[model samples]
Target: ESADLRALAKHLYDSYIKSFPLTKAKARAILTGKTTDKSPFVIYDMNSLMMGEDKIKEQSKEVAIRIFQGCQFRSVEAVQEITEYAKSIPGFVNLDLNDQVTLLKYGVHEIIYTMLASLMNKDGVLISEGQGFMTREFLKSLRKPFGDFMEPKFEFAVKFNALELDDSDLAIFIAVIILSGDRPGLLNVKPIEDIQDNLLQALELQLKLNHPESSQLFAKLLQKMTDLRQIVTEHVQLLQVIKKTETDMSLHPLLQEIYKDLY
Candidate 1:
């Protein structure tokens, strides 16, 4: 029954790989758990590099804020892209408007992190859209709960990257996340539920054929959903703080809408 749906998943997966040829190389390289790729940390002052403790103490709120703003802007753009991609999936656009909103609001965070997993390496996430990498240690050095808020997502990303899931594996996994029947406020869920079931079956079969060394990889992927939920939940707190304090800042309306669903 889902043979065509499976084919759609393959199409989306292949299209994603085709669109991100450069990132795929980085993904494969980062999957090895380390890299000499220092592109992400290019902003360090040369003097700070030589002087111990000089780099971390620089109280460069301007640079941090610049990075923060860039991240938020890019994040909103990514979610809209995700929403469009979800709509592109078989049977997704046919769902009720409310159901589509519900799925997108709840599922966007997990999907973003899952795809963003490709941009992550041991150094940290690739921020500035490939301009630089934000290290876990450096974010922690930033002021207060801001650091507290961002680190867990990166921590989760590093672990997710450790799974070595190529783009195809993640595409199907992301499709599963979007078609989740469990998202709140879903209207007329049976169709979406049925589709989700088909994707699950396809995912399991693919894992069996592709991941012969580990019988438990699928279970681990399932657990990752729970992990992503928790991470996003904490993430809302961080964003809330940003909203309250950064009054001059322009927060993305859609991202805020999604977090409102969470909060």
Candidate 2:
């Protein structure tokens, strides 16, 4: 069983790395600020702060809107990738179609945040496919709820980065998240729970193999899932506030669909 589980873990890791946009090498380069690739999209540079506080305040809304739009686009892509990955999980496709959708809908945000750690260092995250880096300070300068919305994710990402998980570990971790039996509207909880249990065992095995020196790593990783739920909950609340208060801001239909119930 252990050998079979390890092989399953390896297979899932292969699937994750294949579907993931940034290669581990590229992700490492981006994190170290050494990427020379040029993005077709406008790069949001940290030097924008040099425009001075008054200028930043004046332009903050536009910048916020741009950032939101870019993130929305990336999020839509992330959802597609996550859905594909979910299907590759052994028992995932056996679930009812609605259950499958529900699991992806509820679990995608947590999975996205987990993957975000790869594009993040302590100060900020890389966006636009590693073409741009958005700093915490710049995001903090955005007005009101927009400013508040991302800090928690950044806090989560920074700590998650410290765990030093590779794509293989994350593959199982994401499977565990998506197969969670606790998601609302799950019509067939028992099967989902069974799959999740298997994933947890696989994740535990992967973590132990990857982080052999760290005794508490598996427990710590599970704890991060709890932390992720809180962050995602707050994320929903802030999005609701933003939707109600910022009438001019546009959200993609896909995003609106995912967040529809929350609003």
Candidate 3:
């Protein structure tokens, strides 16, 4: 009887520690018998036995914590260090103290909305606004060129200084943005390539920066452009389609900011 009970206890204990990123040493210490074990506390007692296999209890704790607290595998101490580091970076300074806290709180959601927005939404399509973009394919395409997911997606407006966006187009735009985790709000996106003189000029200039690298960057957006053509504006311009007459950059706020970033 005790053997079966002991086996059950080990099973439950192992499953309990699985949610945590604890090292072997940490795991052993926690399962050595004791409540208040893991920092996040996803493991709880299983009724009368206070110990033993409690898969159901552990899973419940996991769900509740993720629903309420979040799956922070890193220790609280590590988060403190990260907070100190963010304050030191440039451009990142735009987000003040409160903004930083909110960013950390909703950071994972923001990430999911941005990068996997398209792929994550099983039913977010509006049929015509574009059969909707394939989230995974677009992600894979950006592998080498992007390196990481930190780069804010370049917004290509369809017209000049004015944003000539429509309802369906806007939805599709927001979808990608949200899926891409760019906007901090919701998984809303509007990756419009501007038809203005400045934007065109900026893209060309940025693409011509060095050679293989810049050229590759241009290639990436272009490939992405082709992928988005199904729902984006029909009058869109491309490097291949238009040989001369680079677009202006100073016309739109977004264009101006992006140009400064890239240039």
Compared with the true structure, all predictions reach lDDT values of: 0.71, 0.79, 0.28
Local accuracy of candidate 2 as per-residue lDDT tens digits, 15-71: 887788875456776566553553222234434534322312256666667667767
lDDT sort, best first: 2, 1, 3
RMSD of each: 4.5, 4.1, 23.7
Task: Kindly indicate the candidate among 2 and 3 with the higher lDDT.
Answer: 2
Clashes of each: 2, 0, 31
Better of 2 and 3 by TM-score: 2
In model 2, pairs of residues that clash are none
Model 2 — TM-score against the truth? 0.89
Q: Tell me how far the alpha carbon of residue 110 in candidate 1 is from the true structure, in angstroms, after superposition.
A: 0.8
lDDT of 2 at 46: 36
Return the number of clashes found in candidate 2: 0
lDDT of 1: 0.71
Compared with the true structure, model 1 gives a TM-score of: 0.83
Give candidate 3's error at residue 24 in angstroms: 23
Specify the highest-lDDT model's number: 2
Over 1-263, each residue of candidate 1 has an lDDT whose tens digit, in order, gives 45765676677787555444335456445444455663434334323323432322254656566557767777777876777678767788888889988988888888887778777666666654554545667766655655685677778887987776766677778889999888877889899998888888777767775778977889999999988888887777777777788787777777667777574
